[PDB]
Amino acid sequence: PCEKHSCIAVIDAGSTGSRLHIYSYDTDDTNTPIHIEEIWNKKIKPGFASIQPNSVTIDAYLTMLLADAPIHNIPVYFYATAGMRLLPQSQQKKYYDELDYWFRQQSQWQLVEAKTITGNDEALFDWLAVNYKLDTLKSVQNKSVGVMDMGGASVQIVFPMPKNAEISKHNQVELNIYGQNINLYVHSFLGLGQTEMSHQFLNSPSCFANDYPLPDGESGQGNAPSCKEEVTSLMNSVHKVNQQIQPLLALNPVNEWYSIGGISNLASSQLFHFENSELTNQSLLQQGDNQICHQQWDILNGQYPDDEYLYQYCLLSSYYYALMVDGYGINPNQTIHYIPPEQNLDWTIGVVLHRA
Amino acid sequence: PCEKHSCIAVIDAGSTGSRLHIYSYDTDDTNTPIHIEEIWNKKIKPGFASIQPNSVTIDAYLTMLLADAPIHNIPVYFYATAGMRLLPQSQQKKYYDELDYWFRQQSQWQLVEAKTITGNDEALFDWLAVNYKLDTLKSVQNKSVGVMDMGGASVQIVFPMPKNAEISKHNQVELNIYGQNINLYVHSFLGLGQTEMSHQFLNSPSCFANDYPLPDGESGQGNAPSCKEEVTSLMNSVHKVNQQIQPLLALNPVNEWYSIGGISNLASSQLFHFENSELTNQSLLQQGDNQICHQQWDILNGQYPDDEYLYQYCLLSSYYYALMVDGYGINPNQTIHYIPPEQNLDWTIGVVLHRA
Ligand SMILES: [Cl-]
Ligand SMILES: [Cl-]
Ligand SMILES: [Cl-]
Ligand SMILES: [Cl-]
Ligand SMILES: [Mg+2]
Ligand SMILES: [Mg+2]
Ligand SMILES: [Mg+2]
Ligand SMILES: [Mg+2]
Ligand SMILES: [Mg+2]
């Protein structure tokens, strides 16, 4: 495989574990990768930012992740995401000093870069991965495509926008893909991913099914519009989502939205009814409110006893609506396409396109 | 030691690790423990809620924590706190089924109870521990004593309040200590502990020193009143702190406040000037704003290069003021006593008093 084509390894060191992807590819006459295929992968737990940063621990982790890979003497990018961004910087440096030493002691792997990427860099890769799979990159479009990543610890949004001198340079990227210049607005909200954000709402009765036992001893008394208003306060007062995103998106409309991350998991539940791997926010909120928020929990749990995430779906439906409608300003009747787990569309494909 | 006196073991299974405390005590003629002394302790990492819940992992963790203890055939309470409260309940059950089996297979340890305690139960123990050490329990007081725990994942507040039929039963406790009936209001806010809450503010420039490098690439531009207003939005809109606490505290005034948890760490920094192991909120906010928020970061870090927490002290000073003044409604000129690490005052003493 790496005899007849180019190969590259990308490690996604995420909040709950690290995922190695090895890709083969060819390069076309615009100096852009084509024919990108995943030829091997490996996942390890727990997250890199949760292990002790010393040589024995890092050696055992990187050995577990890399030792069995079938191929040798290829470039590697090690990119940590939001879990590492949460750590103080002085603590991050301990990991990277150990990791840099480990890669210098061997030869199977040619380390190009090991770093914590910003959420803006992650948003760029998210947009390239989705558009590669949609086959919208090889041609000038005349339809704006926007991507949202609904991640566990951060969320990303990215969409085409001409260069704007009045906007931070860190929220704008310029790249040329398949011969065409592209300008994207990028943004990430650290802490607004579903797992991290959930930690603020666990004792909010509006966000759980009726009679769900909250950790403080109180009972759920669900109401999606109430839970949404709570979540919208965190989004707009702390993260300033609407103030930053909504005016820009209004002037740079997106014709199609695609979302990666947690929405398919929710949308695929037997409790929801969505078709065409898409949803509208109005439908999402109505179905969460009727089927989970105002539902008696014991009866619901009895009908779906093995779905370990079902209890969060009043909060999650409210939260997705708060982010997309109240934060980004998307119309509640706009279609959002979501991409399933069972597509194995991974943001690391964007690293291949931009950096290989 | 356990030959001449009673003994009891309390395990604090907290967010970042578990701490075993073995106490000796005697019992007075009111059936209340006296002479409570810690005769052994043991700390292990990481947090119980972060390890895999299977028999090999739990056996290795509990062995590491308990095997070396000097004494045998004593009652044990295993109490997990906010880190376990964050986990879904179905996941918590896996831990407790393994733990219950492990204790049934041996005899050094007589397990009384293993559970996740609510933040309300934790607040009760916090108040008893502080008042035991202040020697205010053995006598009827005529001065109301309030306690705040500024924890890593939740915060607690507790103060005397007569029984009120209009208030949740879960936020009120009744107990008799040294022959005297006590009625306390208790409350906990899960997610508002300093570590968990910080995860929402890391890209907020008002909360960091000038030019501090935020994870998204932007620079700190500190301003304590701005960072405080951000934190107050999360406290009052999501957690509803002021709506719940402020009216009750206004009608049930506290004459002395004591705080356990993170404030001593901050207040003890060479950058702050506090005397008498106490502070006022007005002074805390002014000193954070002048010494950290509006301070040039590179120069500050150069003068205090080994203080790994200093970078957070604009956020932390703002956050403590937001919680105490904007959330609980405490006057900015009111003295708050804080108890240092170097007192080893631990909330588990409250378990001895209430349950031994
Ligand atoms: Cl709680
Ligand atoms: Cl419905
Ligand atoms: Cl970021
Ligand atoms: Cl000052
Ligand atoms: Mg090439
Ligand atoms: Mg190029
Ligand atoms: Mg965490
Ligand atoms: Mg007794
Ligand atoms: Mg008694």
* CB of A212 closer than 8 Å to CB of A203: no
Q: In terms of CA atoms, which chain A residue is nearest residue B84?
A: A215
Do both A71 and A134 map to the same domain? no
> Alpha-carbon distance A321 to A330, whole Å?
9
Resolution of this deposited model, Å = 1.5
A203 and B190: CB-CB below 8 Å? yes
Nearest to A50 among B50, B168, B230 (CB): B50
Q: How far is A178 from chain B (nearest CA, A)?
A: 28
* Chain A residues within 8 A of B230 when measuring between CB atoms: 237-238
Is the alpha carbon torsion for A134, A139, A143, A147 positive or negative?
A: positive
What CATH number does residue B71 fall under? 3.30.420.40
Instruction: Evaluate the CA torsion angle A233, A169, B216, B221 in order and state its sign.
Output: negative
The C-alpha atoms of residue B312 and residue B204 are separated, in whole angstroms, by: 12
CA B4 to chain centre: 32
The alpha-carbon gap from A213 to the nearest alpha carbon of chain B, in Å, equals 9
Q: Using a CB-CB distance cutoff of 8 angstroms, which residues of chain A are in contact with residue B190?
A: 199, 202-203, 215-216
In sequence order, which residues have a C-beta less than 8 Å from that of residue A65 and are 6 or more positions away? A11, A18, A20, A42, A44
Query: Which ligand sits closest to the CA of A355?
Result: 6
Range of the domain at B73: 1-117+346-356
Using CB atoms within 10 Å of the CB of residue A205, give its burial: 0 to 12 exposed, 13 to 18 middle, 19+ buried.
middle
Same-domain pairing of B15 and B65: yes
Residue appearing with tokens 């209430």: B354
Q: How far is the CA of B114 from the centre of ligand 1 (A)?
A: 16
* Structural determination approach: X-ray
| Residue B197 shares a structural domain with residue B240 | yes
In this structure, the answer to whether residues A111 and A228 fall within a common structural domain is no
Detail the DSSP E strand segments found in A229-276: 256-261
Q: How many domains does chain A have?
A: 2
Query: Which of B237, B243, B244, B304 should one mutate to test binding to chain A, selecting the residue with the greatest count of A CBs within 10 A?
Result: B237
Give, in order, the Cα–Cα distances in Å from B228 to each of A184, A238, B199, B319, B333: 33, 11, 15, 6, 17
- Is the preceding omega at residue B46 within 30 degrees of 0, hence cis? yes
Q: A68 and A192 in one domain?
A: no
Q: Which residue on chain B is closest to A203 by alpha carbon?
A: B190
3-state class of B39 per DSSP?
A: strand
Ligand located closest to A170 CA: 3
Asked if A218 lies within 8 A of B170 by C-beta distance, the reply is: yes
Residue B48 CB contacts under 8 Å (≥ 6 apart), including other chains:
B13, B18, B61, B80, B83, B84, B95
A46 contacts in B (CB within 8 Å)? Answer: 50
Pairing of strands B256-261, B335-338: parallel
Give the DSSP H/E element, type plus range, for residue B157: strand B154-160
| Separation of alpha carbons B70 and B42, rounded Å | 11
CA dihedral B299, B300, B303, B304 (to 10 degrees): -150
Q: Give all strands (DSSP E) within B262-350, no chain letters.
A: 278-280, 335-338
Distance between Cα A290 and ligand 2 center (Å): 5
CB-CB under 8 Å, A216 with B119: yes
CB neighbour class for A163 (10 Å; exposed up to 12, middle 13-18, buried from 19): exposed
User: Is residue B132 located within the same domain as residue B271?
Assistant: yes
B27 & B174 share domain: no
- Indicate which CATH number applies to the domain containing B290: 3.30.420.150
Chain A nearest CA to B210, separation (Å) = 16
- Do A10 and A101 fall into the same domain? yes
- Residues B163 and B286 both lie in one domain: yes
Q: Are A57 and A202 found together in one domain?
A: no
C-alpha of residue A323 to centroid of ligand 7, in Å: 21
Compute CA distances B315 → B117, B194, B220, whole Å.
29, 10, 11
What backbone phi and psi angles, to 5 degrees, belong to B268?
Answer: -85, -5
Q: Are residues B220 and B298 in the same domain?
A: yes
Among all residues of chain A, which has the CA nearest to that of B16? A50
Tell me the two tokens of residue B11: 């395990």
**Both structure tokens of A87:** 């750590």
Contact B234 A234 (CB under 8 A): yes
The answer on A129 and A96 residing in a single domain is: no
Contact A137, A346 (CB under 8 A): no
Q: Give the contacts of B293 (CB within 8 A, at least 6 positions apart).
A: B206, B208, B209, B210, B222, B223, B224, B227, B314, B317, B318
Ligand showing the shortest atom-to-Cα distance for residue B289:
4
